[PDB]
């Protein structure tokens, strides 16, 4: 996961 802010990268 890189920064995509959906599957559970840091936005979780």
Same mark, same amino acid.
């Given at each position: ?5 959906? *599957? =559970? *990268?840091?936005? =979780?």
């Amino acid at each position: 996961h890189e920064v995509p802010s959906g *599957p =559970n *990268p840091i936005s =979780n």
